[PDB]
Amino acid sequence: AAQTNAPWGLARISSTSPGTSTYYYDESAGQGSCVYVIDTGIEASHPEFEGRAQMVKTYYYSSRDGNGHGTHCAGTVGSRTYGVAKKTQLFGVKVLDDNGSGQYSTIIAGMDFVASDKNNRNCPKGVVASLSLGGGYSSSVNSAAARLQSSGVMVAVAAGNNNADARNYSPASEPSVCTVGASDRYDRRSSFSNYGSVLDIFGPGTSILSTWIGGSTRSISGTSMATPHVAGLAAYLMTLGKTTAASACRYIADTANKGDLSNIPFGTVNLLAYNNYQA
Ligand SMILES: [Ca+2]
Ligand SMILES: [Ca+2]
Incomplete structure (x- = not known):
C-alpha cells in the first residue's frame, strides 16, 4: 500500500533517503496487534481512529484527554491519516493530568495496570506500550518499565527533550526498554533530543502532524512524537511476524x-527506524 502526500515522518520510515512524500507499507497495517498509549488520554471519538481507540483506565476524575x-x-x-500502523487497536491509559503532569506513583501504577490488563484483551499479534513521558532519574520508575517489558509487552519510551545524556532521566535510562531519540526532516538529531549510550533508536520528532482534541490536527515537536513512530513500527512488524515483543527493539x-x-555525538547510535518495505 502507499499513502501519497503523507506527513514527512511516515515517508521517512519507509525510505532509505530523506525528502520523499509517500508512505509505503504492507496493508496488514498492524491489524491483530494492540498499542497502549500511557499519557493524558485519547479522544476516542476522533474520526481518524475509526472506532479503533478506547479508554481503558484513568487515574483522574475523567477519562477524557483535556490536553491533546x-x-x-x-x-x-495508529490514526488513518497520521499513523504508522493504520489498523492497530489503541488503548488509552490516562496517567497524566490535563496539564500534562503526573506523579511517579501514578505512572508506575499505569504501567503495572497494562501488564495485567493485556491478559484480558484479544491481541493475537502482540502488545506494545508507548510512553511519551519521563522526568529525573528514579529507580522505581525504571523498575516498573522493566517489569512491563518482562511481562511480554514491547515498551517504547521517549529519550527526553533536555539536549542532555538520557542516563539521568526515567524511564529513558532503563536499559531493557526501547529508548527513542528524535530527528528532523533533514536527518539531523532534533536540537532538543537527549542522546547517550542508552538510546536504542531514533525516529522522526520535529514538526510532526497528528490528531488533536476537538477533532482537529496540530503539528508539534519532541521525543514524545518520535516514540509513537517506533511503537507503531513494532506493532506493524509483530503483525507481519518479523519479530516479537521481547526482540522488537533489537530487530x-x-x-x-x-x-x-548528523549532529550525533560520539557514543550515541546512528540508527533511524525503517520498515524495509518491498512491492
Ligand atoms: Ca540513507
Ligand atoms: Ca534499550
Missing part, C-alpha cells in the same frame, strides 16, 4: 537506516 498530547501520540501510532535497530543522521 495523548491524542497526538495515539494518532502517530528495529538491526534493520534501521544506519549512519544517516
